[PDB]
Amino acid sequence: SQFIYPVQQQPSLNHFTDPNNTTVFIGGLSSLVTEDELRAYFQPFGTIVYVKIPVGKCCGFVQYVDRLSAEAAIAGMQGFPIANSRVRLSWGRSAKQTALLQQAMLSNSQQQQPGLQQPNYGYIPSSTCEASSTMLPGCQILNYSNPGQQVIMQAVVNSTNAMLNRLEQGSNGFM
Amino acid sequence: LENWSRYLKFVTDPDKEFVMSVFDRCLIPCHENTWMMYIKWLTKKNDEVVVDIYQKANTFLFKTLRYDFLRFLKRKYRSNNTLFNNIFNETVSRYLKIWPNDILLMTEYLCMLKRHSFKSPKEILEKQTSFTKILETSITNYINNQIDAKVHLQTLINDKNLSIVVVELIKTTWLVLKNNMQTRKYFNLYQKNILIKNSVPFWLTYYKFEKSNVNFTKLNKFIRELGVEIYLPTTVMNDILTDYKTFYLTHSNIVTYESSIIDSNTFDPILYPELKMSNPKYDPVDWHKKTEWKEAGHIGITTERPQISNSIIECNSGTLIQKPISLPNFRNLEKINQVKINDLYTEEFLK
Amino acid sequence: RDIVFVSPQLYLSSQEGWKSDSAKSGFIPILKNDLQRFQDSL
Amino acid sequence: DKYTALIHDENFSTLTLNVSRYPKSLAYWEKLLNYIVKASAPICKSTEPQLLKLIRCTYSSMLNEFPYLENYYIDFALLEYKLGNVSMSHKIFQRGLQAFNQRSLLLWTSYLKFCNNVISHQKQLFKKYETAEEYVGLHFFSGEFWDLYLEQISSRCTSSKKYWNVLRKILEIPLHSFSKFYALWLQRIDDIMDLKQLSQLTSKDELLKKLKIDINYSGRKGPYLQDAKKKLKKITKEMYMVVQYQVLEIYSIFESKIYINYYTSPETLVSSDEIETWIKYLDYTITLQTDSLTHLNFQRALLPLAHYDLVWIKYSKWLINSKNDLLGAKNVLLMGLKFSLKKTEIIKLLYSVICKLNEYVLLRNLLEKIESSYSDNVENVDDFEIFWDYLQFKTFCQNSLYSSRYSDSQSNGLLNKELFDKVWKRLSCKEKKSGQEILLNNLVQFYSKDTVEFVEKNIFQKIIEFGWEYYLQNGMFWNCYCRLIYFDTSRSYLDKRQYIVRKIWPQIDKKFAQSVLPSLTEFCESYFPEEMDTLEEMFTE
Amino acid sequence: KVFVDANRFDIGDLVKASKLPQRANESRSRDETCESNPFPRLNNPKKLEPPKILSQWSNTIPKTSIFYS
Amino acid sequence: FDIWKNLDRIRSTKKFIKGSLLILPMRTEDKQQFDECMDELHKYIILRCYPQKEGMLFYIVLKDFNILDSCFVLSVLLAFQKRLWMAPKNINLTGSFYLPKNIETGSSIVEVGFNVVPDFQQFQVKACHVSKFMNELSNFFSQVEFGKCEANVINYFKREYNRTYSQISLALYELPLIGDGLFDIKSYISKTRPIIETSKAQMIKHISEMKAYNEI
Incomplete structure (x- = not known):
């Protein structure tokens, strides 16, 4: 007939195509930065699987758990000079x-x-977790948690406790 | 390793030095948890030999065991001075190469320094002023690059480290004497240099200090140039902004809000930390050539989306009946299936 | 007509006029019985 | 009699109790529905007027209980229509559209397919389509709406000129079923043969200057018309290329991963990969800047997302940032306080937006509404963030009203004697209520002279004389206590030292080495080392 | 009730009455509630159908879509 | 700094409307002081004040005015509303005002996209100061033109406005009972509970597959 369903081809699988890669890459990274402070950069956009840094060059990997976290990160930090x-x-x-x-x-x-x-149905993206069920739509019942990493359920009390202790120790090191 | 775990658990069941010798033999086949558990069993036996074993482990090693060795060694600290020189050399060996830049343990050093080096009221006065001297000469020294025979002054330097030293300098200047001026001279001296400006605890002590000077105008100048000039971590950024919102509401009123509302164009100090929680690259204030439109939605790729100039989509039907319609002008038309990437990862990292 | 129109948000908020026979806006129908329901919430 | 027969049946009463106990349980209310109508007759004017008032008020409570129900808008409006009362059915669909802020296509297409049969007056009836068109025309699955409009404007007009306008308006819009309309318009290009109606195709002058065809032509006009038609097919190629690329993009990125569009019942949940598509699609349309499309897509995603507080906050932070109305964000933000089950974030953002708006009387009225909503006793709620944000903006508005109580210290911050009893009752809980410590950090940050003496004497000395166990034995209380003292503008360093040993002494002196030793030691290690020596000498004993 | 064509009340009694006499040999109705289909993405629905395209201009599409399924 | 002086200023700068109307809701928690000042305004100088009952919802409607008589009044009221808060020439006015959308019109006051209110296109005012606001207001009311709608339309508006904000009062009163009493929890958990269990299983299997894909 006049109307055919479209047939489009498949691209190569490199690291831009096929949206599932949630490993944001940072380049131009300084030597000052390494394995903890990148995680302190890229934590609030989403739950981090890991951050890994080959020392021999100026690169760096983080891995979020969703694409939205990664996409908000890439939109957030392009040209954002960190520490240098x-x-x-x-x-x-x-x-x-x-x-x-x-x-x-x-x-x-x-x-x-x-x-x-x-x-x-249990997870809501870019939901950060810190370190009685009543499942509801607003309760966002599931959340990853990585300090092994697990799937825990629940408050923002804990995140506020953690940020107050983090700021009390923010004057000094312990970081 | 499972056989060594069975031998270690069997040793946990039960002379003791022979079992520790067998544990050292298994550690020679090995690793860090074995040395830590060995130190735990030695602490159960009950010190100097355990200090020797810890120094041997630090020679053998990797951050957690040696950092815990420093923390545990500072727990037996009030016994003597020999342990101070011992930890001191352990530390300097760790600052030098093994843990090169590493914020965490330098402030542990300086807390270890001030205890031994300094320990009546006029004497405590001149004592702590000399303790400010010993740090500010050090900072002027690194700005002049003339490091003397002072192993403290050698350690202090190490590229992300000057941060904590000027932190504790401004800390002991302000907190002790109510100096309040030479502090501000140090803030203005240290705002200008580069290695010290993108530091976390400097601006965080600036934050606590400006809270103590409850004047909000310096705080709003602080927040307004945070994301775009101060260039900080975003865990730390979010935390400063939410704590600023809390602090604002717990210490303000309407009439200084409305005054502190800047006229027509800019932020407002309640809404602005709340809009800008995330998104640090943010500015309060030509279409379809910018990078966010080319990279829109499919965020992978800069593509050239063909669009129609003189497209009438926003107009109604009635205003479209008013004049007869002018023909579609076509923009880019030809960069269909034309797909352009930075390829920044492959190019930088792999090549 | 032996039916009275009743909202639970206004009852549990203890606002006045949680029952009215005259169908204001968003009240649920309940019969004249009214007390089994009155017991159901608590 | 069947009205009273419905009353005296016990099924209706039991199910009525089931429902009126539980508003937002949809599935109870669905049985309520089905019982009333299916237990009733085939519904005509012969039925009892009491029963008909019952069905009207039943759906009115329904529709004002779940305002995003398209199908039950249609069901009330058509069932109400079958009785008669056409004017009321117009009022009903217009109430529905007003509930969807005049968007979301299904109410539109069904109202309008209805409106074809009812309304007779052509200028006005097409004006109603026009008001519909600027709101929901640009909608992506809106093909049925246009197909309705195009068949209609083909039926009533005699000159084709009004129809060509809409055909030229379609193909610019990225529809899903664009291709039916391109087929209609390619067929329409193929039919035109008298060569003077290319004037009514597009404007004569721009047909000359851009495309080089004369309409006035003294020649044989056969090959001239055939060249004219074949030359126009190139222009429609390039238009079809642009809009086909856009729609194949919209489809392949977003609509291939959206399965649910329709708002089932706030019980039901939505998949994570689904949310992942929706928020990207919201993000996508923001860049297009075609405002009708992005109003529509935020409102459109707001159907199955309705109350998760992702999309509402996404809207408000969109309108504040990009479009800059800054009051429309207040409005939608109210409208999603109106339902989003985690109301905490939306009430905090609503607070902040209205503090920017400088509608403070609205703020104070809303905060006393949250008083009367918890019916008093805001300290006793389990989640702490509502009491938190409540408490902050209540202090802000309050100490902006009543202030200048503390001389030379001013701020009036969080220290009304009433507000003191509020925060004290939040604080006197002893671990029954969570996040107790977090108040103290904002108390401890007060400062200077009268009032470290006050807050120390008022809160902390009362704590020390009583000593709730869980509330004395955490490290953070001791930490904050020495913190509030150690940061004052009113004294030297040495009385700070004498008083920090004076504060470390009196209430610990006892086991607590798992608890106050780690936090208190990190304080002591933080701000000096010398009394950390004497500190460890105390706890060691 | 609404799109299943004779449960609408307005056109509803037609399609029962417009049914032909069925003398030779050889509906999802109002009973359906919310709790019939609780969770639609448990029992797999088919995806949204891919939009249709003129075969006359089927050759001029974007070759090689981003993001393979 | 003076309202009447600026009123004369654009009496001199700018050289009624057939069916003119303005609705303006006020909120002053102090009802009595607002009466003490609005009665003073009416004794100084069409502007009907309609109550509805703190939270005093007082509507000020403007009908058939010559432009200046609006340019006087609105300013005062908006300058009244800040005056309670700051210190009972300095700090400006913000707020709103409403017009009935039956208008053809042909930076400091803007058509609000998304009104809540049916058919009243909310016009918000921005944070411009007194003289600039007065000039922009007068310029804008030189630009507008209405069609008649009369119908005692404030009775309609007072229905709809109170309907919306009583409904917002309803949601605020839903705040304690979210879930636990407003919909059936046991019949809810009975269907959401194994599904969230399956999802937690899906996510832990996923994280394990991520550990496999991530390591080695």
């Missing part, structure tokens, strides 16, 4: 895949990470 001059943000491919990439550079020759499954 500018940073430059794009999606890392991150970990062991990168080792496979360097090996494939050696052999002169890609895996989507698992984003999620289906629904959950």
Whole structure:
């Protein structure tokens, strides 16, 4: 007939396509910065899986748990000079895949990470957690938590307690 | 490792020095948790040999065990001075290379320093003024790069470290004497340099200090240039803003709010920390060439979205019946399936 | 007509006029019985 | 008699009690519905007027209880229509549209398909479509609305000129079923043959200057018209390219991951990947700046998202930031206080927005409404953030009213003797109520002279003489106590030292090494070392 | 009740009466409530259908979509 | 600093409207002082004040005015509303005013996108000072033109406004009972409970797959 459903092609799987990569990459990172203060930069935009820093260069990985957290991060921190001059943000491919990439550079020759499954109904994105059920829509009953990391349920009391202790110790180090 | 765990648990069941020798043999096959548990068993036995074992472990190692060794060694501290020189050399070995820049443990050093070095009221006066001398000469020293035979003054430096030293300098100047001026001279001296401006605890003691000087106008000049000139962590930024909102409401009224409302264009000090909780790159105040429109929504890629100039979508039907319609002008038209990326990751990191 | 119109938000907020026979805006219908429900909330 | 027969049936009474106990349980109210109408007759004017008033008031309580129900707007308006009373049915759909702030397409298409059959007066009837068109025309799945409008404007007008306007208006808009309208308009280009109605296609002058066709032409006009038609098909190619790229983008990024559009029943939950799509789609439309589309998409996402307080806060922070009305954000923010089950964040943001608005009498009235809402006793609520934000802005408005009680100290901050009893009753709980410490950090930050003496004497000395166990034995109380003292403008360093040892002594002296030693030690280590020596010498004994 | 075509009350009695005589040999109605389908994304619905396109201009689409399924 | 002087100033600067109308809601918690001043205004100088009953909702409607007579009044009232708070030439006016949307019109006062109120296109005023606000107001009311709607429309507005804010009072009174009594919790948990259990299982299986994909 006149009307056909569209047929479009598949792009290469690199680290921009196929939205599931939630490993934000920072470049132009200074030597001052390392493994704790990047996590202190990129925590409020969402729950962090990890932050990892090859010492031998000016790079850095964080991994959020959602794409929205990553996208808000990339919108938030491009050209945001941390501790010294500018940073430059794009999606890392991150970990062991990168080792496979360097090996494939050696052999002169890609895996989507698992984003999620289906629904959950239990999780609400960019929900930060700090360190009696009544499940409700507003209660946002599930939340990741990483200091092993687990899936815990619940308040913002705890985040306020944590920020008051963090500011009391914010004068001195312990950071 | 499971066999060594069974031997260690069997040793936990039960002379003692032989079991510790076997634990050291298993540690030679190994690792950090074994040394920590060995130190725990040595503390159960009950000191100097445990200090020797801890120094051997720090030679053997990795942050947690040695940092806990410093913290635990400062718990047995009031016994003598030999342990002070011991921790001192352990520390300097850790500042030097093994943990190079590392905010956490320098203030642990200076708290260890002031205890031994300084311990009547006019004597406590001249005592603590000399303690301000010993830090401010050090800061002028690093600005002049002329480090003397003073192993404190050698440690103080290490690139993210000057931060804590000027923090505790301004801290002991203001808190002790009610100096209140030479503090402000130090704030103005230290606002200008670069290594000290993007530091967390400097601006955080600036924050607590300006709270003590309850004047809000300096606080609002502080908040307004926070995200765009002061360049801080955003956990720390969010925390300063929410605490500023709380502090504002617990210490203000209407008439200084409305006065502190800047006229027509800018922020307002209740709404502005609340709008700007996140989004540090924010400014209160040409279309469709900016980077946010090219990268819109699909945020992966700078693409060139074809759009129609003289598109009438916002207009009604009636105002569209008024004049007969002019033809569509086409913008970019040709960068269909044309897809451009910074590729910043592959280029910088992999190459 | 032996039915009275009743809101629980106004009752549990203890605002006056939580029952009215004359269908103001958003009151739920309840019969003249009224007391089993009055007991149900507490 | 069937009215009273409905009354005396016990099924209606039991189910009525079930429902009136529970408003926002939809599934109870659905059985209430189904019982009333299905237990009633085939509904005509012959039915008893008491029963008809019952169905009208039943749906009126329904519709004003769950205002985002499209289908029950249609069900009340059509069931009310079948009786007659057309004017009331107009009032009903207009009440529905006013509840959807005149958006969301389903009420529009059904009101309008209804309105074809009712309203007769052409200028006005097309004016009603026009008011509909500027609100919900740009909507992405709005194809049925336009198809309705195009078939209609084909039916009533005689000149095709009004129809060509709308065809040229369609194809600019990124519809989902754009392609039906391009097929209609390509067919329409193919039919035109007299070559003088390219004037009524588009403006004569811009047809000359941009596209090079004369309408006045003294030639054979066969190949000239065929070249004209084939030349116009290139312009419609490029328009179809632009809008096809836009719609294939909208589809492949966003609508392929949106499954639920329709607001079921605030019990029901929405998937995380679904939210993940919605917030990006909200973000996406912000960049387009076509304001009708983004009003529509915020209101449109607000259907199945209705009350999660993600989308409402997203709206308000959108309007304050980009569009800068700054009062519309207050308005929508009220309208989502009107339902969003976690009201905490929206009440705090609502406070802040209205403090920017300088409607302070609104603020004070809202805060006394939160008094009367908890019916007194705001300290006894379990979640602490409502009492928190409540307490802050209540202090702000309060000490902006009554102040200058403390001389040379002023601030009047959080220290009304009434407000003192409020914060004391929050504080005198002893671990039954959570977040007790957090008040003290804002008390301890007060400062200088009269009032560290007051707040020390008033709060802290009363704490020391009584000593609630859980409230004495945390480290943070001792911490904050020495903190409030150690930061004053009214004294030297040495009385601070004498009084910090005087404060560390009297109430600990006892076990507490798991508890006040770690926090108090980090205070002591923080601000000196010398009494940390003597501190450890005390706790060691 | 509303889109299932003769439960609408307005056109509703038509489609029962407009039903033809069924002399030769060989509905989701009002009973449906909220608690019939509690959670629609448990039991998988089909996705939103991909929009239709003129085959005359089917060759001029964006080749190679971003973000493969 | 003077209201009448600025009123004369744009009596000189700018050289009625057929069916003119302005509705303006006020909120002054001190009812008596507001009476003491609004009665003073009416004794100084069409502007009907309609009550509804702290929280004194006093409507000020303007009908058939010559422009200046609006330019006088609104200013005073907005300058009245801040005057309670600051110190009973300095700090400006902010607030609102409403017009009936039956208008063709052809920076410091703006058409509010999203009114709550049916059919009254809320016009908010920004934080411009007295003289500038007066000039912008007079310029804008030189720009507007109404069609008649009369219908005792404030009776309609006083219905609708109180309806909206009584409904906001309803949600505020829902604040204690969120969930626990306003909808059935046990019949709710009975369907939401295994689903959230499955979701917690989905997420922990997911985090384990992330640990596998992340490590090695």
